[PDB]
Symmetry: D3
Subunit: 311 residues, 6 copies
């Protein structure tokens, strides 16, 4: 496989309409989770991609496997764990901030949080081009963190999305120490991050200065996500910026994962960072127009149509 | 009780999609009515609020009372009237004017229209901090109008939303004479109005001139709603303006009630007009994004988050 | 025209699910009204049919005329009345009695209740083969009852469905008096009734005895509805019985009208009572399987298929 | 308050259609939980009823409080616990057994499982007529079990539903020991149970013999639920049996709680066990016709209509 | 009749949400077809309009005739053809280009494609004021194209919408040849077109130059659609421009037909090009806010309201 | 592979509610087609199953392949054909025959109809345990028929479901001659049929006599479907019968495919005809309770639970 990702796939329940969850009567089910969304983007851009994860021995774990198979993700290393349940979350949409979403997790002690070094096979990982994980996987348990540290030991090249979700950590100081340890121990081929995470990790906001400090930490390429203001990619002395597009927002959840998987998979195929960035932006624009996170992540050719035709 | 509101609560039937009602196949039920929406906003800002009203002895009247109880409204004075039915209305959305709604009422001779001076106990009304009603209550019947005049005599302080709904009156001249008469008779702590109503009452639309005239009529605080152009509040020699926010409109119905009840309730607890105004606009912004009038009216704390975070 | 029916067409709102209306959140709209449902069955059996009625100058009245025109009913005598509104009703399904429907009307002083003798043209009525109405039209106002009396005086032949809805009458004695009076003044070529109505009109429930007593009042054909125990038709001392079919009941409202319009239009065309009865039973069976009253009313050829194939 | 119940209220998510959850795209939200359903039945039969429970400081906990308030349950002793989350469950309907349901819980370490003796106020409990709880509350944590043991120490009279849900216990032997300890320590005024539980607790099936053995344990009245075969009530030398009714089943979850709360609240008002049983059966018939557990639980008067009119 | 249109009416299936069709689970049905949409606008502006077409002897063909009859279109020349089926299409919305729709047709060899010169009666056509068709009808088969040629030879006056749908033609050259040929043979009183079609037909996109070239081909009035930049109408060296309104786009399909039918029916009635253009813009604005093509097409009086009140 | 099936997979559009399609507004999409449904049942009983088929190069063809992959079907021989489209059909439910469905096809000249002998590789087919097809595949085109005859020559063993769909054939005589010719040419391990087909093929309906005749034709096991009267299986001198279960019917479409694929797959793995039959009926019972054909086809273990528990 070209790309191996480590994480916890989840079931997402989205309210049918905006508003506090206590007034929501209906919920639509989607398959999501940060690294799963990312894998969908990698496979849409025509690389093979394997998710290493656990699911519970239950309907929702089967849902995750079948969905992933349907979408062309290698599912051989999604292990069923009879010892716990498949994690899920709910999205509260547009309240109290319109066009934004808030996640309510039911995932503590889930089968996905039991991901562990035992699941990481030396030979398997060495025969891939790139290993990806995120700060979510580093947060969910000590053994998921140690799975990432092992997989990153064995990898030929690594990507990391900082993705700090404060609800998943005991403190921001714990998040910071955990993530910086990773950056200090390993070279990172593509780091994906944003102003909020970078303020916690480096205490800087300016993207030019963020790249200078991340580069010191061993990062080669930085994808710096600015949301409604676009995104910036850095590599060596190239800086590429691409503005966001205006579209009606249904749910922005997972937009960042679509952008990151698209960017990384194109970068891996030898596309330059300007092309990979513009495609990451096309992908993150399409997925926000619907409740689900990854159904609208474009293939390479569809993102090229979007880029040539939409304004 | 902090606030007493007098009015006719109603069941609202909202079209599932925009267009002329003859093409609408599905309707979503909401509990609404202008003073009910107002009371929901009062209790969201942490004041006690009692609605004095009648409902029919039917499922829709039980719906109104249970929903109000759920939301922390004091329902001790919503009385069940066996002689008549609970009034309802339908909303036609987006036709012939996009992003606007038209109401089709089935409330002639309803239970709520039977609200009368006998429902207004002198000691109960004296033991409240403020009494609120609207031009809709002044229109629904002569006895409901007299209930309002009686409650206003008895109140420590008063608020009035002029809310002229031409379909509820025999003529605009009648509307004008009825509301002007109430304004001349009483000091009004907070008057809520808009250009359309003020053109009828005062033959002016310029906000500064409307304030000048309402002030001589004994209005202390004026809230002047300009819809997509925002809103203005005046008190003494101070004027606050906040513009509207751009959000996708599902249904604006009840948005002025969310603004009024939020403004009045915060003003009553000592907040300045700028704060009460900005929270008013936040409340009105949230509710227009969904079908239904009051589910998304924010608490004081949620409206602060909205004002701090939404751009 | 072959058949003229006099009545008040209405908009019906159905819940999706059983239960008390205060817990129902969504309603589905259907065009209905007992005589409108009857006319749909007449035209499905290939006779021309004109409904004499009023509707309001409002979207629901336009919905009724457009819907009737869609289904082949002559709408040239459905009058728009700008002085009042189109009546409507809600159905509460399965509570507190499973598989039974209860109607909640908003029709008082409606446009339809203003049907009057002025709306009945002597020449137009004398040119039809048969005039039909029901005890609902007799109940809605004194002027509607007078419209029926006038149309029956002019008619070549008549049909009447007793359809006593106690909620529509000041007393059962009033319903009894009014319906008996029509039976004493006119020959009735087809009377449609049931044990509940007949117990009121005659103090009889036994079908054979009901025929004898109605035949003594000048009724030629009796159609006697036994719901889940089938129906029986009588003409000239000959009885025809057809058993009901077992299907899941979604909503029985209007199933009698489908049966009546089907039976009468076939009878008028020269079909025997056995054939017309079996077709009426087919029509009632299909209608009760869905929430609408008349969309599933079969054409003559589809009812023959039902009878030849369904068991 | 007449009745105090101890338990964990929950949010229920029901699939819109039958089938394995991995193929379900939509879920409808209801407020449920065994003792909450029971309280709804008590309040419908006109006794006051207090639920002692915890909910999390989250949208779903608020939902539970507001719903309960709407329905007339005393909510003063539903405590918000900021330390954990409100439990929820999903219902898989009609697969692999048609017309049956299976529950998938997300409730471990929930705020409801933290119910504890500290929540049980000596004075409060002594001033009620009856304390109810179930084998579910005894299973969810050691401290919820000790809350029940304390509340049962202080009670004037007690009801217990055995309700053994094997998924909630480490073994059936643990369930048996826990429940029998309760029966051995305390007199039980009404025990509610069924063949499955009684086989675990007493190793008997025959209901006549079940009553003989339960009576030895201090039980006064036994309600013995037989599902599709009806139910039996025993008191002293009275045995009452009432057959089930045939209705279309949408979801039987909570039917047993409707029957138990109805039975117990009527028994408390001095109705004999034949009347209380027939009403329990009417209540359990209505709730199975819809997805939710308690919206259709009848009041006393509605259950009397059902009993006199339905067959 | 005032207006005769020749075309193929169709059933449209819309997804609820953006995205590729393979992830859409629910489709909403609408009756549509470019000339049917045009006829609805003609009748909304109070002229009589007859659609000459074929449909299949199937439920979808009956849906088309009943729907057309509901809306006031003369359906006497919508022929049922038992040799083939009613054509349909699906719309894929917002993917890969947000706010754009793509049609997926199932119409090959349909009943509608068998429209032929035999269906065109000399006397009937000579009795109308104007005949309309589009480049879609020219594309569907050689016999449909010959039907248009015959109707145009007989017509008192003509309207044509170029509406080039490349998927319906063997080549763009074929579309160009066929449409130019019609323009060379006949005077056209109203040509409706846009920059994409005009670039093909004339190698011009500039509106003023388009008018000059079309005027040289015998076109009297040019209506030139610029989508989000408005529309322009030309007659006798006079230009009228009307800017578009900003509304959320649900589905633009058929918005051109609403504009064209509205513009042409007003023009025919003696309205000037400025008034007819502003009304056409009102009609297109309303249609694009919903999934259907023609339900929101306004009457003349509602379009005047839109123009006087909407900003 | 254990089983190879030859056929045309299709997209099914199921009406959201019963009735004539002209009144249906919403359609739910399912992936179906008789041999696809069959293959789902094979892989649910733990045998590998490959479908040989063509789909179009369109969204609906990608839908079919992804869904099949999700469900564990080997999709290596579902080939994408750019020359044509993926066939679809609509289901009209409950009209004119309650609890039955009618299919309206849009599949003439589809990609799937282009299945041909060139798709059938001799070595691939020889390396499977059994080949299955149906009378539908024999009907869709001459080349698809020849694909089946070629695959059957090559197979180690064969199964055939006669499945005569009169709408897919030029005459019943053609159906008869085509299927009889296949039966005379080949031994058939399992023939699945029913009275309607057997009356056409053999001019008998008596199950024992049908077995006698099919046995001389070289059929080893006969599965004879009697619908609501259950089903019979025969092998040698043994006959098993299982009656149907009473469940609410949503859509019976595909129920015979669930039965056939379940029976064949269990029979192939050594289960006796009683076991294969009872599991067949369980599968068919589950699927008729929902719209959609194959989602509720049980695994071997779930069907055992059904047989052990459902009464």
């Amino acid at each position: 496989v070209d790309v191996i990702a480590l994480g916890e796939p989840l079931i997402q329940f989205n309210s049918f309409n905006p508003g506090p969850l206590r007034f929501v009567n209906y919920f639509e089910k989607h398959v999501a989770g940060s690294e799963l969304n990312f894998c969908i983007a990698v496979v849409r851009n025509h690389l093979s991609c394997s998710l290493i994860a656990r699911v519970g021995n239950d309907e929702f774990g089967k849902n995750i496997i079948e969905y992933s198979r349907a979408q062309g993700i290698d599912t051989s290393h999604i292990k069923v764990d009879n010892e716990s349940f498949t994690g899920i979350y709910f999205i509260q949409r547009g309240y109290p901030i319109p066009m934004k979403s808030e996640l309510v997790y039911y995932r503590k002690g889930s089968a996905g949080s039991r991901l562990s070094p035992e699941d990481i096979n030396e030979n398997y990982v060495r025969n891939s081009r790139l290993v990806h994980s995120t700060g979510i996987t580093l947060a969910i348990s000590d053994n998921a963190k140690e799975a990432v540290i092992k997989a990153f030991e064995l990898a030929k090249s690594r990507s990391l999305d900082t993705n700090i979700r404060p609800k998943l950590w005991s403190s921001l100081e714990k998040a910071k120490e955990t993530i910086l340890s990773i950056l200090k121990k390993y070279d990172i081929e593509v780091l994906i991050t944003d102003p909020d995470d970078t303020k916690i990790l480096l205490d800087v906001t300016d993207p030019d200065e963020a790249y200078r400090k991340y580069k010191e930490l061993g990062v080669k390429v930085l994808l710096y996500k600015l949301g409604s203001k676009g995104a910036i990619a850095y590599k060596d002395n190239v800086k590429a910026f691409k503005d966001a597009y205006k579209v009606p927002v249904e749910d922005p959840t997972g937009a960042g994962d679509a952008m990151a998987g698209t960017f990384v998979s194109l970068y891996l195929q030898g596309k330059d960072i300007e092309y990979s960035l513009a495609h990451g932006i096309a992908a993150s624009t399409l997925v926000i127009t619907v409740r689900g996170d990854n159904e609208l992540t474009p293939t390479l050719e569809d993102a090229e149509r979007f880029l040539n035709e939409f304004k």
